[PDB]
UniProtKB/Swiss-Prot annotation:
Domain of life of the organism encoding this protein: Eukaryota
Classification of source organism: Eukaryota, Metazoa, Chordata, Craniata, Vertebrata
Protein name, as recorded: Tyrosine-protein kinase JAK2
Gene: JAK2
Tissue-specific expression: Ubiquitously expressed throughout most tissues.
Location relative to the cell: Endomembrane system; Cytoplasm; Nucleus
Residue stretches making up the Protein kinase domain: 14-285
Length: 291
């Protein structure tokens, strides 16, 4: 059966305006839905280089997003069953300021530490909410956070999100990767969990405090530590060895020690010792409130 109402967004009234994002397997476009043919601007996600397995994953992704209703999660609006109801596209609210990764670079001169901590708090709260559904995001990064306005960000994409098995606290991926955001046990055992999302959240917090400055990204810093000339699997082997023996991204320029300490606590090789998203949201909000 049709998991969504197929009459809500009819393809003949969904008009393309602009490309917003693009990867190897998906893209997001700005469109306008004008049923009166005379409408609302929306964001539309579609597959690229689609396959039956990717379409099945996309259906799971759509079901994930439709199940989430939270101030710091982008709003699902519906599905368009295009190509004569032989294809799927996901309809979402359009967030006018784009990805946080780009916004931070464009507006770094107006964004101070307390503003970065507001962004940190909101991402944390979206992640607390995901955990209540037993969803593991698996792709937390500033490129996947969107800006609604100067005071509100939202987690914007769920293309890699998985639901935990009923009887397990981790999801084991078979055939796989943003390796420079991955927790060590994801690299060495293919295991993803709430705690590996907390590791990746530490990387997001690092990204925020770098302001996405050139040469400070996690890939650039890890490659500088590993050796820039290395290629292929040797990179992974060195990253594993580096993380297991306490190699870490550096404290960003200007970053307070207290905030670097939060990053370092998220980057614990002991999975059970990492803080929870609830711990993190309270700690960050108390820092903001005490400033
Ligand atoms: C890699 C596979 S993917 O392509 O599928 N993937 C990439 C992906 C990453 C995430 N999350 N994404 C999602 C969106 C997206 N953007 C928007 N608004 C938007 C507004 C803007 F003003 C701009 C600008 C364009 C020109 N600039 C110079 C300035 C800012 C913009 F870029 C986006 N609203 C949305 N609602 C739901 C999704 C969504 C965008 N990228 C999901």
């Amino acid at each position: 059966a049709f998991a969504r109402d197929p009459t809500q967004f009819e393809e003949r009234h969904l008009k393309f305006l602009q490309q917003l994002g693009k990867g190897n397997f998906g893209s997001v476009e700005m469109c306008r839905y004008d049923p009166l043919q005379d409408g609302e601007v929306v964001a539309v996600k579609k597959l690229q280089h689609s396959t039956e397995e990717h379409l099945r994953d996309f259906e799971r992704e759509i079901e994930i997003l439709k199940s989430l209703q939270h101030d710091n999660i982008v709003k699902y609006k519906g599905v368009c069953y295009s190509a004569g109801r032989r294809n799927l596209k996901l309809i979402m609210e359009y967030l006018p300021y784009g990805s946080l990764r780009d916004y931070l670079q464009k507006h770094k001169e107006r964004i101070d530490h307390i503003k970065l901590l507001q962004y940190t708090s909101q991402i944390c709260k979206g992640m607390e909410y995901l955990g209540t559904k037993r969803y593991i995001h698996r792709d937390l990064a500033t490129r996947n956070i969107l800006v609604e306005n100067e005071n509100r960000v939202k987690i914007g994409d769920f293309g890699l999100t998985k639901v935990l098995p009923q009887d397990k606290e981790y999801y084991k991926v078979k055939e796989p990767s943003p390796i420079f955001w991955y927790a060590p046990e994801s690299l060495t055992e293919s295991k993803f969990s709430v705690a590996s999302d907390v590791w990746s959240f530490g990387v997001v917090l690092y990204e925020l405090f770098t302001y996405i400055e050139k040469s400070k990204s996690p890939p650039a810093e890890f490659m500088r530590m590993i050796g820039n000339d290395k290629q292929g699997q040797m990179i992974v082997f060195h990253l594993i060895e580096l993380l297991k023996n306490n190699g870490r991204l550096p404290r960003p320029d200007g970053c307070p020690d207290e905030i670097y300490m939060i990053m370092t606590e998220c980057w614990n090789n002991n999975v059970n010792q990492r803080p929870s998203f609830r711990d993190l949201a309270l700690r960050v909000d108390q820092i903001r409130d005490n400033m």
